[PDB]
Design an enzyme around this catalytic site. Structure first.
Site, PDB file in Angstrom:
ATOM      1  CE  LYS A  45      -3.749   2.112   2.686  1.00 12.34           C
ATOM      2  NZ  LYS A  45      -4.594   2.747   1.659  1.00 12.34           N
ATOM      3  CG  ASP A 139     -15.222  -0.615   7.744  1.00  7.58           C
ATOM      4  OD1 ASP A 139     -16.474  -0.716   7.703  1.00  7.58           O
ATOM      5  OD2 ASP A 139     -14.562  -0.214   6.777  1.00  7.58           O
TER       6      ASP A 139
END
Ligand SMILES: *CCC(=O)N1CC[C@@H](Nc2nccc(Oc3cc(C(=O)Nc4ccc(CN5CCN(CC)CC5)c(C(F)(F)F)c4)ccc3C)n2)C1
Length: 278
Positions: A45, A139
């Protein structure tokens, strides 16, 4: 930031230029890359460094947690970070795909035996995050549940109709029990191949439904085991004060059964991949 990538229990000296790009995976930015020194293929990432002090420490703070979760087999491993002037690069173990995409490839449900293994893994991941690091996820959903061709199932956080938010999170005047609710919704979705909340006009409509309607439980006519139906119903307790914590969930029959039961997630995953495209 140390001077190494830590992979499969070993520490390899590394610099940004040792990484070779094989292409983007996402659509924050994610690349399949090859580490030259070993040939290990990894997920990286790339994040722009934002100039907000607090807004750029929660980057660091969350990495801190994943870096220190090497001893939990149900959490996606971080191999290390590279920080340049504009950019942080975060190197992770590459997982084949996520549950969301397996649902799409399947065009239908994921079998209970797979979901049972997934439940033990995700519940243990969350329990671990709470007990060892005092963190909550916030989440939980199918796109944050990763599988690979060795049959591993791990929790991740990609940080980027469907609703997973607990009623008490939608409208407070939240602790681990919100994640438990999100696990349950996730399971109904994956087990039925269908979003649980059905008539989805808008986002407001859906949040209203969560607040007003009864929890959407596993339907009774698909051969779901009694203990899987029960597990989901306990996760989907609207009154959060009544909702079980992880230690209680870990005592549940569904979990105890799937801990011991040998299930060949690897072969299933391989089959699914060999028979579908996107
Ligand atoms: C749907 C699948 C998909 O689109 N894919 C594209 C890329 C494919 N594979 C893949 N393989 C491995 C990793 C990866 O993406 C990454 C994941 C992560 C990551 O999971 N980060 C992370 C950050 C933070 C946490 C800790 N939590 C702390 C508490 N709260 C904050 C309030 C939430 C975060 C976690 C943890 F949950 F612990 F796992 C994880 C980072 C980098 C990459 C590249 N893609 C599949």
């Amino acid at each position: 930031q140390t001077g190494y990538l830590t992979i499969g229990g070993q520490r390899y000296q590394a610099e940004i230029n040792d990484l070779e790009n094989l292409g983007e995976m996402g659509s924050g930015q994610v690349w399949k890359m090859r580490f030259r020194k070993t040939g290990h293929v990894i997920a990286v990432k790339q994040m722009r460094r934002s100039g907000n002090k607090e807004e750029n420490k929660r980057i660091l703070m969350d990495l801190d947690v994943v870096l220190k979760s090497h001893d939990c087999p149900y959490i996606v491993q971080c191999f290390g970070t590279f920080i340049t002037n504009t950019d942080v690069f975060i190197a992770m173990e590459l997982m084949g795909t996520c549950a969301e995409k397996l649902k799409k490839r399947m065009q239908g449900p994921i079998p209970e035996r797979i979901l049972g293994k997934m439940t033990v893994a995700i519940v243990k991941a969350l329990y671990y995050l709470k007990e060892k690091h005092g963190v909550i996820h916030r989440d939980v959903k199918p796109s944050n549940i990763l599988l690979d061709e060795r049959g591993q199932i791990k929790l991740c956080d990609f940080g980027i109709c469907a609703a997973y938010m607990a009623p008490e999170r939608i409208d407070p005047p939240y602790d681990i029990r919100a994640d438990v609710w999100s696990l349950g919704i996730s399971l109904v979705e994956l087990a039925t191949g269908q979003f649980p909340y059905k008539n989805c006009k808008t986002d407001f409509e859906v949040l209203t439904k969560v607040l007003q309607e009864e929890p959407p439980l596993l339907p009774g006519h698909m051969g779901f085991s009694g203990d899987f139906q029960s597990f989901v119903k306990d996760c989907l307790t609207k009154d959060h004060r009544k909702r079980p914590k992880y230690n209680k969930l870990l005592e549940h029959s569904f979990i105890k059964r799937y801990e011991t039961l040998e299930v060949d997630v690897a072969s299933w995953f391989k089959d699914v991949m060999a028979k579908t495209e996107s």
